[PDB]
Design a protein around this ligand. Structure first.
Ligand SMILES: Cc1cc2nc3c(=O)[nH]c(=O)nc-3n(C[C@H](O)[C@H](O)[C@H](O)COP(=O)(O)OP(=O)(O)OC[C@H]3O[C@@H](n4cnc5c(N)ncnc54)[C@H](O)[C@@H]3O)c2cc1C
Ligand SMILES: Cc1cc2nc3c(=O)[nH]c(=O)nc-3n(C[C@H](O)[C@H](O)[C@H](O)COP(=O)(O)OP(=O)(O)OC[C@H]3O[C@@H](n4cnc5c(N)ncnc54)[C@H](O)[C@@H]3O)c2cc1C
Ligand SMILES: Cc1cc2nc3c(=O)[nH]c(=O)nc-3n(C[C@H](O)[C@H](O)[C@H](O)COP(=O)(O)OP(=O)(O)OC[C@H]3O[C@@H](n4cnc5c(N)ncnc54)[C@H](O)[C@@H]3O)c2cc1C
Ligand SMILES: Cc1cc2nc3c(=O)[nH]c(=O)nc-3n(C[C@H](O)[C@H](O)[C@H](O)COP(=O)(O)OP(=O)(O)OC[C@H]3O[C@@H](n4cnc5c(N)ncnc54)[C@H](O)[C@@H]3O)c2cc1C
Ligand SMILES: CCCCCCCCCCCCO[C@@H]1O[C@H](CO)[C@@H](O[C@H]2O[C@H](CO)[C@@H](O)[C@H](O)[C@H]2O)[C@H](O)[C@H]1O
Ligand SMILES: CCCCCCCCCCCCO[C@@H]1O[C@H](CO)[C@@H](O[C@H]2O[C@H](CO)[C@@H](O)[C@H](O)[C@H]2O)[C@H](O)[C@H]1O
Ligand SMILES: CCCCCCCCCCCCO[C@@H]1O[C@H](CO)[C@@H](O[C@H]2O[C@H](CO)[C@@H](O)[C@H](O)[C@H]2O)[C@H](O)[C@H]1O
Ligand SMILES: CCCCCCCCCCCCO[C@@H]1O[C@H](CO)[C@@H](O[C@H]2O[C@H](CO)[C@@H](O)[C@H](O)[C@H]2O)[C@H](O)[C@H]1O
Ligand SMILES: O=C(O)CCC(=O)C(=O)O
Ligand SMILES: O=C(O)CCC(=O)C(=O)O
Ligand SMILES: O=C(O)CCC(=O)C(=O)O
Ligand SMILES: O=C(O)CCC(=O)C(=O)O
Lengths: 400, 406, 410, 409
């Protein structure tokens, strides 16, 4: 029926499908998404921050797309007149031990070409955020916030305007040259090749492939806390902490929203379910397969204490606010409301390392391909990652 | 925006909305559904059998709606030309004890006048691969895609001017000629209307508490797992083969029915689900788990029928036990001929005394406010809601006309 | 250097085994190690205390011969040592026609095993023996009785000590090491040491765990089956005069929840067959996670659960809600209710299971592989045929015969 | 009728209290009821075996005065009875500058508590006492010794029996009833009974459960904390000559995992502070649903967990994966790897907790609320100040003073 299929209606699957039709406006392309609308998971439950690229090492690949995709974003945001707001980000350090890591963030940032990286300290901290403390802080006024779920549906609007079709409520679940079946009998779409970009199910899409199970996706939920509208003037822009460089998580941070709300998060607690957006939502066969994975216990043998304290502050938010008072001490417990959350698609190898790079796997064979992982931030680098994915398309599939 | 809104895109929520607009084309009616499509839960995960009424006591409203629903169904299926197959229904009895419970069903079935029962003894001509000692021949029974006819209910509802709101998860009722306002999960998605009706099925109790209705009764999920008979032995079952069920429970037991595509599926069973929408065994929700266990009526029913609940659970853990039970009817089926298939969840209502509620349950908030008196909740409907959909719709329409003055 | 033979186990099996071996060989220096404070602290001290006559067992096997011979040896032992006992009758009652056909099989097995002296009593003559019990047909056995089997174990140790034997209490055997006496036994306490030539273990609930400390395989495995009891209050103690047993399923060694009087006049209801979540799990709450991750990971557990999990869940369900247990007992005594019962103490069965899932009921002797010192000289009795209390003296003669053959004792 | 006063509890506190009450009153028929088979089979028999000098305790308090006097009273008792002991000397190391400020606060407290020959040393002088141990600064208490408190507990019992006292072993107290001897104590066995006039219970892990039998409130409830130890191999035992303690968090009574030699020459690593899912839960898998459901339904449990859940989870994490435990130990002696240790025995702490969630470290005497014979003649010592073993002789004299005023003896 078609010539190319992109399984997954996320910001990665939409930007990759939008990029490949502007390349060649000749192929009949389709997008398969199991939910009603696009950006219903990771790209719909993110912090909304347009990252600049500070934590990443110079000369890396992750820092290449992050600085590029951020520039490609602001270009696409003005092209489509997408509402955005350049708020700026202050990476505040409390102890001197965080300052030593904060200077490593500045040294790694000057080489990634981040616009207007300034290291402030002292009374110059409150001139940008008047309610935040700290000893030293790193300023990046080029960072902004935007509705990434709104940019994702704008990617599909462009994709649909170029002869593309977005098959929604299509939950994939066969050579006829390939035919993709679904949950409803009779729901089948035939095409030449297929590219799968599932979020927390990219590992399960490998089984249809014939790919090896690894790297398995480990769900890490990121809970957000809503600050009451009474005292939201206390947060003007992004207020990030200095995280542990051993983990890709950046820590619970103060970030404004487009509607004026101030969400505090996200955290990094292990989810008992792939799509486990709530604590009580537990799937037995989805964690027994996650805990029997050889790479989990390896990482658990070294980082269990860091995961337990994330869940301890999640069970008792009085401990969470106590840590947040290091930055804004004028925040009480009666000002906090438990809001929604998102779950990360954390890839992991059998050695216990959270996968950092691109992961493309193929078994059906050769005709399929699974972007099982992409460098983060996937939302900021979306258009940049969409190019690198599109350049892996014409090679294996022989396109154009 | 509208004058009446039916919360729930199930088969009884779409049939009630279809009936209320055909009776009153002067009314702007809307339908709010949280899923993407209509009939996504109970109406889309059922055995598909067009029941005729046998297990139901004569003179009961439950027995009257099923005999009225089956004639309205075949008439509606012929009106829209929806594919259906009228298969036989043999209620086979094995032991002599099942016979004493069975000849009650015949006299109970003929009393409600179902055309046309025939007591058989000595079954290889309606079902050659089946066994037993005595059964009932119900040729008027049939299979159907209840999920497909539910979309036809919504198609008729949209043809007459009604709007179907999909991906609309009712989260909050508020006060605003349209006093009540319904809120969705997405910010900004709101609908103002005059009066509200909720047919949330599995969330009928949860939706009722948002208006002011008590926790009584509560919806207790009972999963109905199905086993798919392999393609090499689909010829062993021609029509529906039902067992002789225990009258103390509304469940009809694991039975043999073909689907519209010719596939023979074995089920469903009756097992407590640890989640309202727990279609799989691993998927459990703690707050919904403890909501069912902390209910006063749960421990009361468990104090008298836990052996039967653990009976179905043990047969679900080890399917070889389920095979030994199904071999009483067709002994030519082994563990190598079945596979794990899909399932459905029953929206079983339970009172504070542990009794599974069966009759109609309409409830509204206490007082004379806006959210009260204007929002009526249908917390339960007599089974089978799929077959009796058109008959229940006429019953619900009369309740809406009486409660909301139309 | 200490003893010639050491018996690890203070129960009725190990005590009778040590008593029998010293009576046959007065020159032997034999010792007994018990991990608890006193003899008969577990199975032998938490039982129904009924002296079985040997009805349920098939004719021709050894268990049928051991129970009847052990019962005769018991009454002569109780009369010799002046031990109190009441020869209360046993009445196996059937309530429906299905249990009648199976009770007829119990009559043929009882008359072939020569149990004195059964009679098939009709439903009209049931109250002539039990004026409150109902039923359609029953099987009477007037020569069974009740006795404090825990007290009989103390008498076995008293005879063992009066022949020169030593009983080491509070001695928890933990490891065997090589040393005239090349076997050294170590306790849990530092310095607890006993040198011996040959060891015989009757660990009961830990028979499999003791065997693995020598070189024996994990099979057979000891699966704990707790037997809970109920206390019928005094206000209705007169409704039961003797023993009222139900007609059990022949597929299981469990005899079912029965009415049994005690030596103090009490009436106990039980025991049931509840899977204990602990080797010594006498209560419903005490769980040992490691004893679960090994009892379920055993290849034979799921094989038995695949066929009889509904039977075990039935016993657990009637324990969670005793109103279901009351209705079952009302088939026999229909005028007791939930206000007349109290939860009492329980016992845990040392149920031996093979790799195929079948509950073993024969003699299982095991020793380490090879020709080492820990092997050959340490023989483990993994299982003894039930009832261990009634067949105690009979099993003791056969264990002593096995010890003489295995250890070359003059 | 039988005795004048009985002492429920075979531990070192119950034995020393019964020993003290009969030395001051030789005409008092006193008995001791112990549910186990031997004396000191729980806390008094599964401890670190250290004779504390009195460092971490606040000066001027009762807890600081009992340990200092009890240490001198014990050393005099051991020399009198010729009980073997070794003075190894404690050494508290600070690894970073954050712990050195806490270490100096321990110095000031130790000086005020009159700890003999306490000196503060640092990097150059620590290898002079412990060559294999690293660190920034150290607090050297050379008079801290080790002893077998289980052997000392039995020496208390033989002294209690020399003066006419009776020790009832395998006596599981299960029920108190009314009858010159008005109160009757019931055992777990039938007919196992004893009568007396007054009762003093030192149940340790069952301090509260014994008090509930005579009408006392549920508070304070005993919360079980397991103290796990690790056995260092005999090869590397020469690398630890004396006691090596870390700088503990002053917010908790726990002293942390420490290096400690024993009488037989073994070097044990511990104890830790993991929450036991069973009151007598000496192993990881030993749980009890009844003893746990009531442990969670206690109002103070959620409060204490609401503020210190991470400290307890970190201890459990270092016990689940011992590679994290040896890493924390390599901050002191880095030559010890995972191949040098193996899981050993453990002990359970009878930690008392109030309704607000604070770990009570003071005396808690309780009696029945009514005015009957049970509610006025059974005094329950629901908690004793830490440490119980070192302060054994000092606590016994004040417990004897309490029962002398409570019962007018
Ligand atoms: C908590 C959180 C906060 C974040 N904050 C930021 C931030 O501030 N800035 C930033 O730049 N990035 C941020 N990110 C990163 C960014 O949001 C994600 O990395 C990005 O959305 C990844 O795109 P994706 O399409 O792979 O994920 P997804 O959005 O999950 O896309 C996958 C899609 O595949 C579909 N799918 C899955 N399985 C199937 C199937 N079987 N059949 C059909 N469809 C299927 C799903 O419905 C889904 O829509 C954040 C991520 C998280 C988790
Ligand atoms: C296993 C099984 C087999 C069956 N087999 C048969 C058979 O053979 N024959 C027969 O006649 N009957 C059968 N039935 C009965 C029949 O399927 C049901 O009784 C009937 O579908 C119930 O109608 P309903 O509209 O409540 O269903 P549902 O589809 O469950 O209606 C509930 C609807 O409300 C929606 N909703 C819930 N909460 C909200 C909210 N907050 N906002 C918006 N929408 C919401 C849900 O998404 C759902 O679409 C079977 C039932 C089961 C469980
Ligand atoms: C609930 C129940 C009811 C019963 N009712 C009856 C009845 O009515 N009539 C009848 O005839 N029979 C009855 N029996 C059977 C009888 O009670 C037992 O079969 C018999 O007691 C088994 O003897 P034993 O010594 O092997 O058991 P146990 O007494 O359990 O023997 C094990 C002993 O070894 C010790 N031990 C274990 N490991 C070690 C170690 N490492 N070191 C040292 N010591 C150790 C234990 O402390 C214990 O003392 C009943 C059994 C049960 C469980
Ligand atoms: C791991 C650990 C390490 C320690 N290390 C040290 C150290 O280095 N130095 C130091 O000075 N202190 C130390 N201590 C403290 C000291 O060991 C204890 O505080 C001390 O044993 C308390 O005395 P006790 O009698 O209450 O103890 P316990 O021995 O626990 O006293 C309770 C006694 O009462 C009995 N009992 C309970 N209920 C009943 C009943 N119903 N009927 C009859 N008897 C009953 C018990 O069997 C037990 O014998 C340590 C404690 C622990 C847990
Ligand atoms: C395998 C079983 C589960 C183990 C899982 C391992 C996951 C590891 C998660 C790493 C933690 C998440 O990321 C972690 O976030 C915390 C909390 O914001 C940051 O913490 C930092 O910022 C917070 C503010 O939020 C300050 O209060 C805090 O003092 C400071 O340390 C850490 O610097 C960062 O490392
Ligand atoms: C844990 C708490 C559980 C709460 C308990 C409430 C749930 C109780 C469920 C009982 C109802 C299940 O429904 C029950 O299905 C079984 C199995 O199909 C039927 O059983 C019948 O058919 C089966 C085959 O299908 C035959 O093997 C069987 O001999 C016959 O009785 C029963 O007649 C019916 O009563
Ligand atoms: C590891 C797998 C799970 C455990 C495996 C199964 C172990 C348990 C086997 C069944 C338990 C023992 O089974 C025992 O005998 C039968 C059932 O067989 C019952 O026997 C009797 O029960 C009651 C009387 O008390 C009567 O109403 C009943 O008709 C009759 O059968 C006993 O009450 C029961 O105690
Ligand atoms: C009821 C649920 C709530 C959980 C209950 C809370 C329990 C609190 C337990 C406190 C922790 C135990 O006590 C704690 O031991 C650790 C580890 O030895 C000590 O830690 C110290 O010593 C260790 C090694 O011994 C060093 O590696 C470490 O850097 C240093 O801080 C802490 O200083 C002490 O505070
Ligand atoms: O898990 C993370 O910290 C990465 C998500 C992110 O980019 C953010 O929230 O700012
Ligand atoms: O057994 C039930 O619960 C009713 C479902 C039904 O109607 C059927 O499967 O035929
Ligand atoms: O029923 C059992 O499991 C055997 C126990 C026994 O011998 C009895 O209670 O009589
Ligand atoms: O719990 C503790 O750490 C205190 C017990 C003690 O004195 C020790 O182990 O040194």
């Amino acid at each position: 029926d078609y010539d190319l299929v992109v399984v997954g209606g996320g910001i990665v699957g939409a930007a990759s499908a939008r990029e490949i039709v502007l390349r060649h406006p000749s192929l009949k392309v389709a997008v398969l998404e199991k939910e009603c609308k696009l950006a219903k998971h990771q790209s719909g439950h993110n912090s909304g921050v347009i990252h600049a690229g500070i934590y990443y090492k110079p000369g890396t690949l992750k820092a290449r797309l992050c600085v590029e995709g951020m520039h490609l974003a602001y270009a696409y945001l003005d092209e489509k007149k997408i509402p955005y707001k350049k708020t700026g980000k202050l990476i505040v350090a409390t102890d001197e031990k965080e300052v030593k890591l904060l200077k490593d963030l500045e040294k790694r940032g000057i080489a990634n070409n981040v616009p207007d990286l300034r290291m402030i300290e002292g009374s110059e901290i409150q001139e940008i955020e008047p309610y935040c403390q700290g000893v030293m802080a790193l300023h990046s006024p080029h960072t902004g916030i935007v509705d990434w779920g709104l940019v994702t549906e704008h990617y599909g609007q462009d994709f649909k305007q170029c002869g593309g079709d977005i098959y929604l409520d299509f939950n994939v679940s066969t050579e006829t040259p390939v035919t993709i079946h679904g949950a409803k009998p009779g729901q089948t779409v035939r095409t030449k090749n297929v590219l799968t970009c599932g979020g927390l199910q990219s590992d399960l899409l490998a089984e249809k492939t014939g790919c090896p199970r690894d790297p398995r996706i480990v769900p890490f939920r990121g809970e957000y806390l809503l600050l009451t509208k009474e005292k939201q003037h206390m947060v003007k822009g992004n207020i990030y902490p200095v995280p542990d460089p051993r983990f890709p998580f950046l820590g619970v941070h103060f970030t404004p929203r487009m509607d004026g709300s101030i969400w505090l998060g996200p955290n990094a607690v292990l989810a008992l379910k792939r799509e486990g957006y709530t604590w009580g939502d537990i799937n037995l066969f989805e964690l027994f397969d996650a805990l029997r994975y050889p790479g989990f216990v390896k990482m658990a043998s070294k980082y269990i204490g860091f995961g337990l304290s994330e869940m301890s502050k999640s069970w008792f938010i009085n401990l969470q606010i106590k840590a947040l008072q290091k930055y804004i001490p004028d925040i009480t417990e009666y000002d906090i409301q438990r809001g929604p959350a998102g779950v990360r698609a954390q890839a992991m190898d059998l050695d216990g390392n959270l996968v950092d790079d691109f992961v493309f796997d193929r078994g059906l064979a050769k005709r399929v391909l699974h972007c099982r992982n992409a460098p983060s931030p996937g939302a900021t680098s979306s258009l940049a990652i969409a190019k690198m994915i599109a350049d892996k398309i014409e090679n294996e599939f022989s396109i154009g």
